[PDB]
Amino acid sequence: MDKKYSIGLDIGTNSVGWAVITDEYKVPSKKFKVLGNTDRHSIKKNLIGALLFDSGETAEATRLKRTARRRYTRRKNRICYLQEIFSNEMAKVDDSFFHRLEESFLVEEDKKHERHPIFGNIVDEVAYHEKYPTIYHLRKKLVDSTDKADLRLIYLALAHMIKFRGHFLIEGDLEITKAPLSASMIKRYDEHHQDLTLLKALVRQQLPEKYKEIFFDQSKNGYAGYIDGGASQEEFYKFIKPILEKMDGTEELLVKLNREDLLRKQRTFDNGSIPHQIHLGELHAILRRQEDFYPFLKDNREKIEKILTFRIPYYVGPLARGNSRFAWMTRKSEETITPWNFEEVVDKGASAQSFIERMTNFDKNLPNEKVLPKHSLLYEYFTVYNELTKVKYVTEGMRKPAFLSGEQKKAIVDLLFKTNRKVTVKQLKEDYFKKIECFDSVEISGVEDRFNASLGTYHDLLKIIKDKDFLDNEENEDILEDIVLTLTLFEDREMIEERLKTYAHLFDDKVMKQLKRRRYTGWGRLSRKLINGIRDKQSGKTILDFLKSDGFANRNFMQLIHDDSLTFKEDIQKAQVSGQGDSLHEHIANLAGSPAIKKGILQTVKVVDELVKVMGRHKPENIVIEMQITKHVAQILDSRMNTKYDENDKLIREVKVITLKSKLVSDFRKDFQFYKVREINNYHHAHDAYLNAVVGTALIKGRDFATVRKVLSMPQVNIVKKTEVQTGGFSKESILPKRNSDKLIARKKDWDPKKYGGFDSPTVAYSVLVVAKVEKGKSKKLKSVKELLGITIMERSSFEKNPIDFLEAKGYKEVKKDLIIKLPKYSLFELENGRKRMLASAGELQKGNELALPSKYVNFLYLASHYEKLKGSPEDNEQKQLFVEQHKHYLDEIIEQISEFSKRVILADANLDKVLSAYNKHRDKPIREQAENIIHLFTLTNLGAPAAFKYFDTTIDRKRYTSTKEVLDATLIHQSITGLYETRIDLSQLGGD
DNA sequence: GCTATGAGTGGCCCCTGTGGAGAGAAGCCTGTCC
DNA sequence: GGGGCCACTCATAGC
RNA sequence: GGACAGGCUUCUCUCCACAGGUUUUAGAGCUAGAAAUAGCAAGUUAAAAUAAGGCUAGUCCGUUAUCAACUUGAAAAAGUGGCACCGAGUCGGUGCUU
């Protein structure tokens, strides 16, 4: 016999609960076979459990980092182009100058040429640093001076301008000197110097004791920390404000501080508002000044100007040669794209059209067609004729509200739609019914004070074209629709002019000019072919044609597409693409929402599949779920379950799908006092799923209440933590100063971290158990070892490619290949007395046990927690308060059970003693305060990584397991997604000494 | 008589600020419809 | 939020 | 239940850019003193990297999504685990079957 049963599911963002119940609300328990090598061949478990998983992450960070990488690469390319231009003349003066510039980052030992970059000699370098303390001084000198200067200084100025060209927020162009920016920066530098001198003098004169801390201590927020340390400008002002208030003569300095102008640096974050035109002007001035000496400058002047001005248009996209999934550019010729010949290579119009169209939705009724623009004339025709199709009007002498004819529709559109941007009900009644039809009293139904459809595009074309006859000609419909498409697709005036150039023959200069200024945004939901492309086989009328005039039927779009006597429904059904059934992964990915809920849905579906496999492949009667997205989950479940068609090819619904809301179950809990505390454990998800299933089955349809109470008191529930292989950044991105340690990772292959510093704290991908021999001690004696080694994310490819060489690189010898066992994150281990630990990383463990607490304690805790906030009748409130007052001794029992559970699995003796001392010290506090503090206490034993918490005013820090050596002899557990299937492997029997 | 290793403990640490252009989805409000 | 790392004391044994 | 039409709000995906921050090196520190050190001077800028790198060599790609174990598979993927009853501190016992 197949015992009828149903599945209840609770779906969140981090957890998926599953419950299986029979017809009588009983939860069966089965005896399962256990694979492995241990003596435990059979384990009994209950058919209830919940799955926990890490929250899903979006793609924002990847997008930002990819954009940053592209920007850095393109800046490097600009610098390389500048150096390629200059190389010919630079070689004539100093051939090794470029070599010196590139290797300057290395230490003196690794440098191949002389250590001083600019000149290679100490005297000239000192002279340059003395005459020109800042690059802005050199910039102003080159702008104003009329003497032939060193080529290397010109290169430095041009490179400094190019590498920091500034923003492009504005198109077009925007001490009397042509370099206001450099002059302003030099003025700020001089003010900084003078103010620093004055500050030092005043501090030394009045308060000499603080001189050393302010001007020598790099560790504080003083001037030294503001310059050589990591102190920010705001922090420096914060620290220096009280000191200036303690001294005299600081009124000017204090006013400067209030304006954030005291001792201001040159390289400041306010530069984000500098237009690129200032840098362009300085560049052009320098080029003009120095072109009279260097022939190559004036010939390549426009190239240098373009390199600064050029940027890739955003609609074009990356200049990829086919092998990038993000690329869409159309490339005319296979030449190497350069900022000088960009115009002749890239089809700007085609690329822009591809960029716009690839995000446009396909027509749902006709998948192989694209929708029309929201401001398309044909779309506006469709909307207007659809609205006026169902309009009912009541005049004098009319018993029934009549329907408008096509002639009336055309007349009304011509009179008001083509003359008014929007047509209202009152305006219609006054202008057509009162004037044209000469009816004094007319009542219109279906439209609220204004028509939602309007001919805005027609009015724009009337304002611009100013020719009504050209607009009203059907022979122009193709040209007008193409014009509207062109206006919607592009935003660049140049491309708009280029494409409309073909139709410029029908219009004057000004008409073409104002057309170039119009833009439209938005798109419709139907395609051209659907509305007016396909024709009826008999009458030849399209959907639009019927909407214009349909006789007494006056059928709307929905009626036409569901009309059995017309071929529109036939064509729509025939056009349904019988494409490959989307893979459930990609099918779920096609949904709208955060990827986390998609992960939850996929896990839920796999849980359902495994449960069906467990129950002997006999499908349940009902599936209860709780969370459009819920509707899509229900659709997916129905599609996967009901798969057989009857003789009439109808859908055989062997399994019914149920959707429920949390409020009903919450009310059921409140009425029958089945309260839950979200902090005690994770069984609440399973209990909520069980309640969902029970309530659904009861609604569709003392024993039941007793059965529910018995079920909710079960201690054995299957909690499974889904293992995940960590991915992402190689390590923390904060570069740290050099230090003699083996834990640093180099930024580049040949950059020894001991001399350059680098990255720190790699993220562990996974660990593998290794049994081998390692030479330890000064005598290099072989020692057989057995330990866990964590593999970084950066080394995953090397490890997977050839594990043997990678392990030998670490010093391990005699590696037994078949003994390597991959252990993903959160792998489960079993210890003595049932104590369980989850492998968090290579060197840290997490608590892997769940506290089983009886229901009556949970009810008492809930009642005490909201003792003064009960929402119900006064009799119920007083009953609950009295019941709380009856059982004050439960607190001692709760503390005792917590102590026992801690002594059994937590092993936090110092923290447990602190907890006991705090509990004894605060035993006279109000009951509700006691409950509030005790609720926080369960964080100590909750599943997951240990965390700190507060108990009254005493704080208990987190207890961390800093050594994974105990699991080296434990029993490894592999659990299926529902945890019903297990495979247990004993690590102790492997790798004996 | 001296060191080395591991073992635990407590505490500190973690890249950030903005602009432009579009496309799409979803949640509410009104009207008509299948 | 949770894992990585450093400064410190200590356990413990080989020598 | 679904589709279209007007409005409010939030959220998601792709591209172009900018300003920083961090790191190493250069910017002769001087005086007295064996040195520890004491005093004085100065301090704003500059170059390169900004996930290791890869081959498809592009002015491209490298952090989202996908993953219990065993057999067959490059992988997507397919396949693999008795039942009923009585009990409950992480699940225990009893009866039939292979």
From Swiss-Prot:
Only has nuclease activity when bound to both gRNAs (crRNA plus tracrRNA), which results in conformational changes in the protein and formation of a central channel which binds target DNA. Also requires interaction with PAM to trigger catalytic activity. Nuclease activity is inhibited by EDTA. The active site is at D10. Residues 724-993 are annotated as: PAM-interacting domain (PI). Disulfide bonds: none annotated. Coexpression of Cas9 with an artificial single guide RNA (sgRNA) which fuses the crRNA with the tracrRNA in human cells has shown it is possible to target and modify DNA sequences of interest. Cas9 plus the 2 sgRNAs have also been expressed individually in human and mouse cells to achieve DNA targeting; cleavage efficiencies of the artificial sgRNA were lower that those for systems with the 2 sgRNAs expressed separately. Microinjection of Cas9-encoding mRNA and a synthetic sgRNA into zebrafish embryos induces targeted mutations. Its EC number is 3.1.-.-. Keywords: Antiviral defense, DNA-binding, Endonuclease, Exonuclease, Hydrolase, Magnesium, Manganese, Metal-binding, Nuclease, RNA-binding. It comes from the Bacteria. Residues 56-582 are annotated as: Recognition lobe. InterPro entries: Cas9, Cas9-BH, Cas9_PI, Cas9_REC, Cas9_RuvC, HNH_CAS9, HNH_nuc, RNaseH_sf. Mn(2+) 2 binds at D10, H685. Endonuclease activity on target dsDNA requires Mg(2+). The RuvC-like nuclease domain should have 2 divalent cations, while the HNH domain should have 1. Crystals are often soaked in MgCl(2) or MnCl(2+). Changing D688A: Only cleaves 1 DNA strand, probably the noncomplementary strand. Processes guide RNAs correctly. In vivo, loss of Cas9-mediated CRISPR interference in plasmid transformation. Changing R78A: Moderately decreased DNA cleavage. CRISPR (clustered regularly interspaced short palindromic repeat) is an adaptive immune system that provides protection against mobile genetic elements (viruses, transposable elements and conjugative plasmids). CRISPR clusters contain spacers, sequences complementary to antecedent mobile elements, and target invading nucleic acids. CRISPR clusters are transcribed and processed into CRISPR RNA (crRNA). In type II CRISPR systems correct processing of pre-crRNA requires a trans-encoded small RNA (tracrRNA), endogenous ribonuclease 3 (rnc) and this protein. Belongs to the CRISPR-associated protein Cas9 family. Subtype II-A subfamily. Monomer. Binds crRNA and tracrRNA. Has 2 endonuclease domains. The discontinuous RuvC-like domain (approximately residues 1-62, 718-765 and 925-1102) recognizes and cleaves the target DNA noncomplementary to crRNA while the HNH nuclease domain (residues 810-872) cleaves the target DNA complementary to crRNA. Has a bilobed architecture with a recognition lobe (REC, residues 60-718) and a discontinuous nuclease lobe (NUC, residues 1-59 and 719-1368). The crRNA-target DNA lies in a channel between the 2 lobes. Binding of sgRNA induces large conformational changes further enhanced by target DNA binding. REC recognizes and binds differing regions of an artificial sgRNA in a sequence-independent manner. Deletions of parts of this lobe abolish nuclease activity. This is CRISPR-associated endonuclease Cas9/Csn1. It comes from Streptococcus pyogenes serotype M1.
